[PDB]
A paper describes a structure:
The second enzyme (E2) is a unique dihydro­lipo­amide succinyltransferase. To form an active complex, multiple copies of the E1 and E3 subunits attach to a core complex made of only E2 sub­units. One arrangement is made of 24 E2 subunits with an octahedral symmetry and the other is made of 60 E2 subunits with an icosahedral symmetry; both arrangements utilize trimers as building blocks. The E2 subunit contains three domains.
In our attempts to crystallize amidase (EC 3.5.1.4) from Arabidopsis thaliana, we serendipitously crystallized the catalytic domain of E. coli dihydrolipoamide succinyltransferase (EC 2.3.1.61), which belongs to the family of α-keto acid dehydrogenase complexes, in a novel crystal form and without an expression tag. It is likely that these domains are removed by endogenous proteases prior to or during the crystallization process. We have crystallized this enzyme in a new condition and in a new crystal form. Even though EcDSCD is a well known highly crystallizable contaminant, its structure had never been reported in an I4 crystal form and SIMBAD did not find a hit when only searching the PDB unit-cell parameter database. Consequently, reconstruction of the 24-mer biological assembly using the asymmetric unit trimers and the fourfold crystallographic symmetry leads to a 24-mer that is slightly stretched outwards (skewed) compared with the 24-mer in the F432 form. Because of this conformational change, data in the I4 crystal form could not be processed in I422 and the packing is different from the previously reported F432 crystal form.
Author numbering:
A (entry chain C), B (entry chain A), C (entry chain B): 172 to 404
D (entry chain D): 347 to 404
The structure:
Amino acid sequence: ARSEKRVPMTRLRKRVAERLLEAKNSTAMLTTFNEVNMKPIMDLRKQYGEAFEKRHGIRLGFMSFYVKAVVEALKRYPEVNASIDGDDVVYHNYFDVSMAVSTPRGLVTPVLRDVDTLGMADIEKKIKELAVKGRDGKLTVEDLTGGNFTITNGGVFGSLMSTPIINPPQSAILGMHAIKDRPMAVNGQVEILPMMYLALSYDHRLIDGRESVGFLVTIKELLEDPTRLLLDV
Amino acid sequence: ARSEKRVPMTRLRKRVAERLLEAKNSTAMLTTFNEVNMKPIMDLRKQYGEAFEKRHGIRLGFMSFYVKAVVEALKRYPEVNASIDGDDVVYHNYFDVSMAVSTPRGLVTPVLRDVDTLGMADIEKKIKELAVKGRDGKLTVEDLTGGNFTITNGGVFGSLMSTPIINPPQSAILGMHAIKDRPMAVNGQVEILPMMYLALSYDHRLIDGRESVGFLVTIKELLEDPTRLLLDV
Amino acid sequence: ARSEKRVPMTRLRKRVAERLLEAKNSTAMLTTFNEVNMKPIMDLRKQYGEAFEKRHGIRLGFMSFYVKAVVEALKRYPEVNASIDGDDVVYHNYFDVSMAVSTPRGLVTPVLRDVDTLGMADIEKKIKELAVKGRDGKLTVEDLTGGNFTITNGGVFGSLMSTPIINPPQSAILGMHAIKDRPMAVNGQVEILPMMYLALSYDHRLIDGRESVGFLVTIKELLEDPTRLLLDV
Amino acid sequence: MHAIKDRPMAVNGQVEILPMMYLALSYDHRLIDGRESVGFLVTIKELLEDPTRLLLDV
Ligand code: NA
Ligand code: NA
Ligand code: NA
């Protein structure tokens, strides 16, 4: 023991903290995990990265693949793309995806609207536009309100695996993690692959085991072979 | 935005959702993990599978090994085979084990009664009889009521690892997962084994760290060498 | 089913159970994971173990390394070394570290005071002195009250990974686990190392993703090369 | 302290090259005897060959 410096909570971190609590206490939040081999997507960026930027005037990142994979998973599992509004269950026939962006002063989740209708290049541009506004802090309340599902990337900080927190009134959240070289079994041979752990936190009131697991398996399948988005399999 | 189809929840899904919430909020649910090498059990099924079905008229699955291992663990750790009834702690001197079966309409959990008194062949017969009733939907209220402990298998859906949800008034739940070929250290050499992650979610009000961890270690020990059930070690 | 043996809870375990609930329901508890190579620390114990005990009259364990690493991480991330008092955030300018000790009568968490001021030998002596008092049950109310952060070691019981529970009014808890030989990627070659999973459960009201992840990465960095504690890098 | 020079050294019965420096301690033999002077300089050698010994204090 020694001394104590009390610092009061600002209007924001007071209501952010009240809302994370009311989220945790109002939902039956559970987390299902999976792993994904990133070499396929890393190879696409290594091969077509130059040609992609020349054609579209924006660099090909990972986030466009994650969004494209989440939208297809939201189509196959419409129970995950829903809210609970008191006594009603609201199924959304559109794909608005909340996406956590870093600002030095707090962390915000702006919304990408009608992502089902955007190309890979268009997605990466809308993320840069929202990410510039976040870093500068010029983000509208139009930009922050709504969203059916959140993607968070704690991998920028080197986290192996974690339990992400649901952003109500949303039902689920997908947590991206660090890409780490790990020995894997490949056709009965021990081969090193760049592996990432995926976490899906989901509300067990609305989403049962089969849907939560199957949703996250869908995302794993479409990240390990982006070509499956075209075939739809 | 586009359109949304809201459909109100009946007395059922309204109060099932309120009861999953009051369960989650009224217990101190935590999850401890472990891994198990399935090659020993996979080898027993490959070797004695034909001879077992001929003799008993029922196929040798994994679930008989899991039940046999859970019952022995419930005997060694009686704190896990208990409920909390308000101000009382109810220790059960019998082994009724809830067991999740896959049904087209969600997932249902019939109860196996006095499993301590059943042979491997008897267990596999009672599970097939309850699994047929689940798939057909001919499951009695006698069949669903009660149970001291739940075994859930999200591995049927290809989940790597997850936090299963306790089914009150029960204290704990064991989550089985996908069996995945993974490189393992065996006598200082890298050998590929079929590995499964085990998850035990437990009520920290009744079950402390030592009991929860030790219970799940017991199940790992008895699945990696089923011959330990006979020796009792 | 057969019979059931009902045992009442005294105010003993009645108010512990009520307080685990008010802890869980008053905090937004999340858990971030990481892994650490213990070979460096295991090699130091194998090399200097004899010479250390001769010089200080106390055996060199792992817990001195974990405490030394936690204190340095608490300095780099002061938001983790804090409590929430209603509308205030209380920053502590001292390092009192709660440390879970296993006793036949439940589990107790005595406090190590001003650990920032203790050498490796002093730490190991204070842990043995508090561990003897726990096993004997001669532990003071001075010894149990307070603490800014908890370290728990469920690895003594062979747990692979788990979600530790926050010890209010503290913000976070670090969970140590079993050391298991696992194949690891080292300069693109598969080498077997003695690996342990780390779990940090944290209150998301006060601790955001960047701090929680970065705190646990700091502990991993200082356990994989204890010589970084001296250099402070 | 002196120059660091690559020199062949005996290491677990194998000749391996290490970057070696000679240490000199000049001491007043009125106040410091052989055992203390030698033991002082051995301590410095031990703590420079493994700086992690400063943390453990061994
Ligand atoms: Na794979
Ligand atoms: Na194993
Ligand atoms: Na490592």
